[PDB]
Amino acid sequence: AFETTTPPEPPQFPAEGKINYVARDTILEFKALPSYSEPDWITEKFEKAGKLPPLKERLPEEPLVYKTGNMPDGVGVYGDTMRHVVGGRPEGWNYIAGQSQGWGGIDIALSECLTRTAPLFQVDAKDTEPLPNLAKSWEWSEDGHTLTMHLVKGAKWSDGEAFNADDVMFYWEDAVVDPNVSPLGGGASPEAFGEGTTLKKIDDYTVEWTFKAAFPKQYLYTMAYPSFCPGPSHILKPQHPKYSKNTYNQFKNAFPPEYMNMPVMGAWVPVSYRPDDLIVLRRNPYYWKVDEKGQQLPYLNEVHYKLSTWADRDVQAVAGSGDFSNLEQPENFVASLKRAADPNAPARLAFGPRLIGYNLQMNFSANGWGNPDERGQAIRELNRNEVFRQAVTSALDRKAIGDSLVKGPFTAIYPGGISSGTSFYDRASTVYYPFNLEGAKAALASIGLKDTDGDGFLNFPKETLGGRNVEITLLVNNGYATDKSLAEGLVGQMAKLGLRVVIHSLDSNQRDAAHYGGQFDWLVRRNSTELSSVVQNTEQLAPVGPRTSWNHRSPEGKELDLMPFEKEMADIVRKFISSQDNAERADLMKQYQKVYTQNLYTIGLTEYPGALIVNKRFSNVPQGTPIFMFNWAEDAIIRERLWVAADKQGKYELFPQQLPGKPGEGGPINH
Numbered sequence: 001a002f003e004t005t006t007p008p009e010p011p012q013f014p015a016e017g018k019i020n021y022v023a024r025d026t027i028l029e030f031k032a033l034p035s036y037s038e039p040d041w042i043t044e045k046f047e048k049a050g051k052l053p054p055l056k057e058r059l060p061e062e063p064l065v066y067k068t069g070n071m072p073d074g075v076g077v078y079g080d081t082m083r084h085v086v087g088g089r090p091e092g093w094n095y096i097a098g099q100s101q102g103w104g105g106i107d108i109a110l111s112e113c114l115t116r117t118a119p120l121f122q123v124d125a126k127d128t129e130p131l132p133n134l135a136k137s138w139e140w141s142e143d144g145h146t147l148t149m150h151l152v153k154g155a156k157w158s159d160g161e162a163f164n165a166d167d168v169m170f171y172w173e174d175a176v177v178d179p180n181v182s183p184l185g186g187g188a189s190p191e192a193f194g195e196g197t198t199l200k201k202i203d204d205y206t207v208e209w210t211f212k213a214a215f216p217k218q219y220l221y222t223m224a225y226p227s228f229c230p231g232p233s234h235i236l237k238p239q240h241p242k243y244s245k246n247t248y249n250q251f252k253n254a255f256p257p258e259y260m261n262m263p264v265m266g267a268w269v270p271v272s273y274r275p276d277d278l279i280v281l282r283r284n285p286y287y288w289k290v291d292e293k294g295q296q297l298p299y300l301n302e303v304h305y306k307l308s309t310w311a312d313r314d315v316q317a318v319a320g321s322g323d324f325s326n327l328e329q330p331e332n333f334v335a336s337l338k339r340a341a342d343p344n345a346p347a348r349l350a351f352g353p354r355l356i357g358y359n360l361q362m363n364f365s366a367n368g369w370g371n372p373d374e375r376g377q378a379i380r381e382l383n384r385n386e387v388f389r390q391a392v393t394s395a396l397d398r399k400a401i402g403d404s405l406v407k408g409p410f411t412a413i414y415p416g417g418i419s420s421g422t423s424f425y426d427r428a429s430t431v432y433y434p435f436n437l438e439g440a441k442a443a444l445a446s447i448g449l450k451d452t453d454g455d456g457f458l459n460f461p462k463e464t465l466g467g468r469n470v471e472i473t474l475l476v477n478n479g480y481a482t483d484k485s486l487a488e489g490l491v492g493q494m495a496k497l498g499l500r501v502v503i504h505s506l507d508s509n510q511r512d513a514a515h516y517g518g519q520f521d522w523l524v525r526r527n528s529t530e531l532s533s534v535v536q537n538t539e540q541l542a543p544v545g546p547r548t549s550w551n552h553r554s555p556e557g558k559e560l561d562l563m564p565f566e567k568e569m570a571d572i573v574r575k576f577i578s579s580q581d582n583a584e585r586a587d588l589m590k591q592y593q594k595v596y597t598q599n600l601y602t603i604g605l606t607e608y609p610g611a612l613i614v615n616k617r618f619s620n621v622p623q624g625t626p627i628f629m630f631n632w633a634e635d636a637i638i639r640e641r642l643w644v645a646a647d648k649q650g651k652y653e654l655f656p657q658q659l660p661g662k663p664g665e666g667g668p669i670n671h
């Protein structure tokens with residue numbers, strides 16, 4: 001019906017950053033050091049004044065020790081503030097109940113996981129085991145169905161309470177398993193860990209996973225951010241409906257933004273908050289990570305999250321008032337590159353591979369996800385028709401989509417699927433539907449879509465919705481110029497095709513709620529880690545479970561109304577997860593890409609590289625760090641390991657020589 005080909009090779013993109021590829025165990029280890037150290041004011045103004053227990057006590061028996069060999073600039077010194085600028089707003093501190101803290105690094109910093117994957121951009125292999133984090137070690141039984149997992153022994157919460165299997169178990173049973181709780185990120189359903197996966201407590205520092213599959217090693221990546229971030233059980237358990245008189249909404253909102261010093265396993269603790277202004281975090285005294293020389297991390301004493309816009313993060317990182325940006329909006333590229341062109345610029349800018357992608361996602365549930373009306377249901381039915389999808393992708397002039405964001409060598413013709421920047425990507429396996437408006441018009445006419453009332457907009461046949469003009473509801477994020485630009489352009493291209501598209505502009509919190517709830521026909525969405533890395537949240541590549549897919553979920557409780565190609569992709573993804581052979585895995589992903597792009601699981605909008613922007617005074621920033629691969633750069637750069645030379649240090653501390661107070665109190669502690 002259409003003359004499909006493979007996508008054209010994008011312009012050669014050098015002016016990048018090269019990664020220094022290292023072995024997995026070059027970064028950290030767990031061991032006891034002969035002696036430990038911390039900032040002198042802690043020992044002098046807090047420990048000597050009674051206010052805090054000595055360092056050796058508040059640390060695990062074997063802390064997480066960062067190795068100097070992997071440190072880009074070596075061991076650091078204490079001091080300074082890391083100033084972030086975010087476009088998000090805090091909902092509260094209950095991460096495990098699906099509350100957002102404002103993004104742009106704050107939840108990443110606060111919610112430490114069993115494993116860690118973002119620093120893996122620098123590891124040579126893609127068969128690589130995620131790094132040990134809160135789970136210090138793990139072993140597989142001979143059969144490969146049981147995974148014993150050992151936790152950090154002797155670690156404490158920012159408040160002094162012990163960290164144990166009870167906090168790990170509280171998350172599994174009362175957040176993941178509990179059908180009434182939805183952890184942050186939207187992908188923490190029990191099936192994300194495998195259909196039929198069980199987990200049980202062995203002792204205070206040992207847990208045991210039981211998997212249906214033999215060695216589904218890919219699930220260790222799911223135990224990283226955002227899917228397995230345990231919360232303080234001693235604080236959250238008395239507020240949980242299963243253990244109290246609170247509703248699930250009462251539990252979700254039990255710790256609002258005004259509640260200070262929320263127990264965390266993270267490097268910094270929230271000590272101050274002003275609505276639509278700022279969140280201040282001070283170093284966690286009970287932090288369980290050290291360098292090889294015994295200095296307790298983080299090196300940085302303070303973190304700021306300025307509550308602004310995502311565009312203002314770029315503005316501020318190049319102005320020098322903000323210390324970090326993920327330059328990801330092509331509308332912002334030229335302005336930022338001009339400022340970066342000055343040798344006196346306070347920040348450095350480095351582009352990486354093309355890993356930022358946008359897809360048009362069509363809701364494929366005809367079995368009632370998001371409780372559709374007659375108009376909604378008729379769109380679900382068009383969405384599931386392969387001819388309708390083929391015409392929609394053919395009506396898109398992808399060179400015009402790319403130019404509308406930024407001219408030059410940034411954008412690449414993106415038809416959907418695995419990003420062109422990933423090693424798993426095969427151009428020969430990617431189905432490209434070139435721009436063909438006339439063929440697309442004819443394709444829609446072949447499925448009964450004709451303009452009957454002469455207003456230049458295609459009507460359903462009289463047997464469907466009374467023969468009224470087709471109207472599609474497109475869900476978009478308010479927070480970004482790119483999402484808005486893409487949404488408007490799409491409406492314009494669909495108009496030339498004869499289809500009437502109505503924009504549904506929502507703020508990030510409401511958008512995510514409307515997405516995961518199924519209350520959408522179509523949606524503009526920036527790709528998550530599975531299309532940028534494959535190995536991170538692999539379960540999200542296909543509808544392997546009832547809530548794993550972003551565009552095809554089933555209502556609670558009902559079976560998945562899978563189309564044949566979805567069943568094919570799910571078989572390809574399940575095979576990949578349990579595969580131990582690398583060549584098999586590489587071919588499974590050529591197979592996957594082919595079924596995806598030919599059948600149009602999603603419809604690609606565009607793809608381009610982003611740039612990491614970091615203030616020049618920071619040391620230990622890894623060379624060629626991507627803005628997004630296994631996670632966002634905020635996690636990948638290992639912020640608790642960043643430092644500033646004493647002679648280059650800023651004077652930005654709003655609570656100098658202060659520590660976090662007790663949870664629920666006013667804020668920090670002096671004097």
Ligand SMILES: OC[C@H]1O[C@H](OC[C@H]2O[C@H](OC[C@H]3O[C@H](O[C@]4(CO)O[C@H](CO)[C@@H](O)[C@H]4O)[C@H](O)[C@@H](O)[C@@H]3O)[C@@H](O)[C@H](O)[C@H]2O)[C@H](O)[C@@H](O)[C@H]1O
Nearest residue numbers: 103104105184185186187226326477508512528529631632
């Ligand atoms: O946090 C660092 C980041 O902040 C800004 O982007 C944040 C983004 O927030 C909302 O994201 C929810 C997102 O959740 C899911 O995506 C993943 C995969 O599970 O979950 C993690 C984040 O929770 C990531 O590692 C993702 O790979 C889900 O798949 C998806 O539908 C949701 O959109 C989102 O609503 C909103 O667009 C943003 O505000 C910032 O832009 C980044 O540069 C970076 O600093």
Ligand SMILES: [Ca+2]
Nearest residue numbers: 067068069070
């Ligand atoms: Ca070393």
Ligand SMILES: [Ca+2]
Nearest residue numbers: 069071072073
């Ligand atoms: Ca080096």
Ligand SMILES: [Ca+2]
Nearest residue numbers: 039078079301
């Ligand atoms: Ca200091």
Ligand SMILES: [Ca+2]
Nearest residue numbers: 231232263264
């Ligand atoms: Ca927490």
Ligand SMILES: [Ca+2]
Nearest residue numbers: 451453455457
């Ligand atoms: Ca009409």
